[PDB]
């Protein structure tokens, strides 16, 4: 039949009622654990509903699937037809990721907008797109990390219907979709979980708000909440995989860490998890029989930081830990630069070596939402290095053994900043974030100003020299079988370096210098016209630039 069952976990609350807007108020039945439940025969997609507390105040379903009128508005029923392939066609060894912010990616600012850009993406060579968090957040202008309804697809992005159609059309083109999900904290506005029960940890918390309760009193149910959320995205949206936001901010003292369980869920349904770890700890990524949570891959800032610090000369914040050519070679042959050595930035010994894990347990990047957006003036790397360096940078990571991830626009030479923006309506949060971004990052543009968001939309002004470069770089990566293979040989002089893989070798010349080349090869790609078509073992004097050889 057509009847459906309502479930709300609220141990703090004595007795709660269901409120279907056009219909009546319905008394809910309680159990031992603190779950309120009723089955209603008369409900239909898409009625609006809320829950009314002892307080007599009315809150939206915390496990809501659609919030038509934003965070403080009522919850709406959606069509739940669990259609999903049991497998993803994505081979993680073939993974080229493209990070997208739906709001700013296109003039549209919606899912339909990214759909339109699918052919472009496919043609470029990307195999999967990473969508920044889409869990309902305040208003319509937010990176996604102030999301506060884990099961509800952002209304202004195009809602559930919108996101579903995106994955459907992505699969249709042979593209995969990875969802950025937040399990380490929750948004400061429109979060009503605090009144229901111990969703959040008493113990510590995160720089971005209240952290989840995974290991303390009544944490079973909050563990179920997150694990079922990952189950939900797979079963109801047919998503290929996940990027887990700041896993270092998820603390769990339990016999089996929640991150291990999260992975178990995604692997049960043959999907992929990537983790943003700041831990520099192979445990996140290691096999179970080697004591890891078995997450498929992790972000390695060390790579980006090495490249960035060296090319920019910048040393503020975390860049103080980097700066030398050695750091790049280190990261290129050891993954982590900080693998159990002292960090002046963190004021402690940081990290652990990575052992024999292949390259495909790590994703690398010269740009992403953090490394652009957390800069006060939000400058893309293109503004901080010359055309040559920029090309050398793109070559370094796209030709690395690690999984490369392109930031939206990077590939055609996008020049527009990516600022930090928010769309809170609570005036104290507005006040706090302005001064927060002012003090922490040195942002002069108002995050709550519409113009700041607008200025962050891609221009789509294509630089064809750069765009062609990326396209060929991607193509050669695939053709050379560079993926995962950490068996590379790197030699470095003062202002240059050569990296030699199984089928290729690359020249990375940061200044004019005389280089001893020990390899023969045919030129595949070059940032200049200055490099020979065929080269042989010998000494050469190269100008600043990059060259790839078979």
Curated annotation (Swiss-Prot):
Annotated substrate binding sites: 243-248, 301-305, 369-374
Active-site annotation:
245, 276
Domain of life where this protein originates: Archaea
Q: What InterPro entries has UniProt attached to this entry?
A: Glyco_hydro_13_cat_dom, Glyco_hydro_b, Glycoside_hydrolase_SF, Ig-like_fold, Ig_E-set, Maltooligo_trehalose_arc_C, Trehalose_TreZ, Trehalose_TreZ_E-set_sf
Swiss-Prot/TrEMBL GO biological process terms: trehalose biosynthetic process
In terms of SUPFAM superfamilies, this protein maps to: (Trans)glycosidases, E set domains, Glycosyl hydrolase domain
Q: How does it assemble?
A: Homodimer.
- Write out the similarity annotation: Belongs to the glycosyl hydrolase 13 family.
Name of the protein described by the UniProt record: Malto-oligosyltrehalose trehalohydrolase
Organism listed in the record: Saccharolobus solfataricus (Sulfolobus solfataricus)
């Amino acid at each position: 039949g057509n009847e459906v069952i309502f479930t709300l976990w609220a141990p703090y609350q004595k007795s709660v009622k269901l409120k279907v807007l056009e219909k009546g108020l319905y008394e809910m039945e309680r159990d031992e654990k603190g779950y309120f439940t009723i089955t209603l025969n008369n409900v239909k997609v898409r009625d609006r509903y809320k829950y009314v507390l002892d307080d007599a105040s009315e809150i939206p379903d915390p496990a809501s699937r659609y919030q038509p009128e934003g965070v403080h508005g009522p919850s709406q029923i959606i069509q739940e037809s669990k259609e999903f392939n049991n497998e993803t066609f994505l081979k993680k060894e073939d993974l080229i990721i493209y990070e997208i912010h739906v709001g700013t990616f296109t003039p549209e600012g919606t899912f339909e907008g990214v759909i339109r850009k699918l052919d472009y993406l496919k043609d470029l060579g990307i195999t999967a797109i990473e969508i920044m968090p889409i869990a309902q957040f305040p208003g319509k202008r937010d990176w996604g990390y102030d999301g506060v309804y884990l099961y509800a697809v952002q209304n202004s992005y195009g809602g559930p219907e919108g996101f579903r159609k995106l994955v459907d059309e992505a699969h249709k083109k042979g593209l995969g979709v990875i969802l950025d999900v937040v399990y380490n904290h929750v948004g400061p506005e429109g979060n009503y979980m605090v009144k229901l029960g111990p969703y959040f940890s008493q113990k510590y918390k995160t720089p971005w708000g209240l952290t989840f309760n995974f290991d303390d009193a009544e944490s079973d149910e909050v563990r179920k909440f997150i694990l079922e959320n990952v189950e939900y995205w797979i079963k109801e949206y047919n998503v290929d995989g996940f990027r887990l936001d700041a896993v270092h901010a998820i603390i769990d003292t339990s016999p089996k860490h929640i991150l291990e369980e999260i992975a178990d869920v995604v692997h049960k349904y043959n999907r992929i998890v990537i983790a943003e770890s700041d831990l520099n700890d192979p445990r996140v990524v290691n096999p179970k029989e080697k004591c890891g949570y078995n997450i498929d891959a992790q972000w390695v800032d060390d790579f980006h930081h090495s490249i960035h610090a060296y090319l920019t000369g910048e040393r503020q914040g975390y860049y103080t830990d980097f700066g030398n050519l050695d750091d790049i070679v280190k990261s290129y042959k050891d993954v982590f630069v900080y693998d159990g050595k002292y960090s002046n930035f963190r004021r402690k010994t940081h990290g652990e070596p990575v052992g024999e894990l292949d390259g495909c347990n790590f994703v690398v990047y010269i740009q992403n939402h953090d490394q652009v957006g957390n800069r006060g003036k939000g400058e893309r790397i293109i503004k901080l290095v010359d055309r040559e360096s920029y090309k050398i940078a793109a070559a370094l990571y796209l030709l690395s053994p690690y999984i490369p991830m392109i930031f939206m626009g990077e590939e055609y030479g996008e020049e527009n900043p990516f600022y930090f923006f928010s769309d809170f309506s609570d005036s104290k949060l507005i006040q706090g974030v302005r001064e927060g971004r002012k003090k922490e990052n040195g942002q002069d543009t108002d995050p709550q100003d519409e113009s700041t968001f607008n200025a962050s939309k891609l221009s789509w002004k294509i630089d064809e020299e750069i765009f062609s470069f990326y396209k060929i770089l991607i193509k050669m990566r695939k053709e050379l079988s560079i993926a995962c293979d950490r068996r590379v040989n790197v030699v470095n002089g003062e202002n240059w370096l050569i990296i030699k893989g199984r089928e290729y070798f690359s020249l990375y010349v940061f200044s004019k210098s005389s280089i001893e080349v020990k390899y023969s090869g045919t030129l595949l790609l070059s940032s200049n016209n200055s490099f020979p078509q065929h080269i042989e073992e010998g000494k050469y004097e190269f100008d600043k630039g990059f060259a790839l050889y078979k």
